[PDB]
Amino acid sequence: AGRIASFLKNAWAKEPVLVASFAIGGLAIILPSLSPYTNYAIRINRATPYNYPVPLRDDGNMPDVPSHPQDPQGPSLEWLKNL
Amino acid sequence: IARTFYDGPEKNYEKTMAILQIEAEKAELRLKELEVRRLMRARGDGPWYQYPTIDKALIDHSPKTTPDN
Numbered sequence: 314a315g316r317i318a319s320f321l322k323n324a325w326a327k328e329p330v331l332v333a334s335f336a337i338g339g340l341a342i343i344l345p346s347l348s349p350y351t352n353y354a355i356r357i358n359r360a361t362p363y364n365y366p367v368p369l370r371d372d373g374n375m376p377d378v379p380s381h382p383q384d385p386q387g388p389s390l391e392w393l394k395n396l
Numbered sequence: 397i398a399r400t401f402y403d404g405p406e407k408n409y410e411k412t413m414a415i416l417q418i419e420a421e422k423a424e425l426r427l428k429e430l431e432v433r434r435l436m437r438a439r440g441d442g443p444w445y446q447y448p449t450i451d452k453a454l455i456d457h458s459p460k461t462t463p464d465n
């Protein structure tokens with residue numbers, strides 16, 4: 314951890330472009346894993362209705378399936394309105 | 397000489413009888429195998445000469461975004 318500081322100083326003094334590019338690339342590689350917002354992006358992508366939601370035939374054993382779009386059951390996008 | 401070096405004729409007799417039986421069964425089995433191979437290559441309903449088809453587990457049975465299909 315002592316020679317690497319001298320190497321970094323020499324690289325910054327001689328070739329700053331490579332240092333900046335490597336720093337940016339490493340930052341972009343590492344940070345998305347630690348970011349808690351990636352799951353929000355995935356959920357937003359999953360919540361986009363490109364195609365029609367085909368209704369399900371009622372067999373009398375669907376308590377979690379809404380009978381109307383305004384019924385309280387089903388997925389809710391309230392978390393998106395606050396984001 | 398006969399007592400020391402050789403055996404009785406019945407020994408050779410029964411030995412060659414057993415050999416003949418074995419060879420006859422082998423010949424019959426070879427002919428039957430040829431016939432079975434011919435039939436199962438012609439028809440294809442046997443275990444051998446089975447050529448792969450497309451697995452039906454790859455099909456997706458879900459709504460396809462269009463009503464007809």
Ligand SMILES: CCCCCCCCCCCCCCCCC[C@@H](O)O[C@H](CO[C@H](O)CCCCCCCCCCCCCCC)COP(=O)(O)OCC[N+](C)(C)C
Nearest residue numbers: 397398399400401402403404405406407408409410411412
């Ligand atoms: C009596 C005097 C006057 C007459 C002389 C007659 C001369 C006859 C002697 C010459 C022998 C001819 C050689 C033929 C050898 C046959 C080999 C084989 O067939 O024998 C096998 C066994 O071999 C025999 O034991 C004889 C082997 C001896 C080999 C002969 C070599 C002698 C030559 C002398 C060499 C001298 C060397 C000197 C060094 C300095 C039998 O197999 P096995 O399945 O088990 O037995 C079946 C019968 N049973 C089941 C009833 C027992």
Ligand SMILES: CCCCCCCC/C=C\CCCCCCCC(=O)O[C@H](COC(=O)CCCCCCC/C=C/CCCCCCCC)COP(=O)(O)OCCN
Nearest residue numbers: 321323324325327328331332333334335336337338339342
């Ligand atoms: C696994 C991570 C990958 C993702 C990040 C990288 C993304 C893309 C960026 C890299 C692009 C390709 C870089 C190619 C490297 C070539 C190096 C080379 O051989 O060039 C040397 C010159 O380069 C050097 O000096 C040797 C290497 C210098 C340092 C290289 C990077 C070391 C690490 C820097 C960043 C460290 C981490 C960031 C810390 C930031 C500070 C807190 C030759 O010099 P010339 O210009 O050809 O001729 C000169 C004479 N006329």
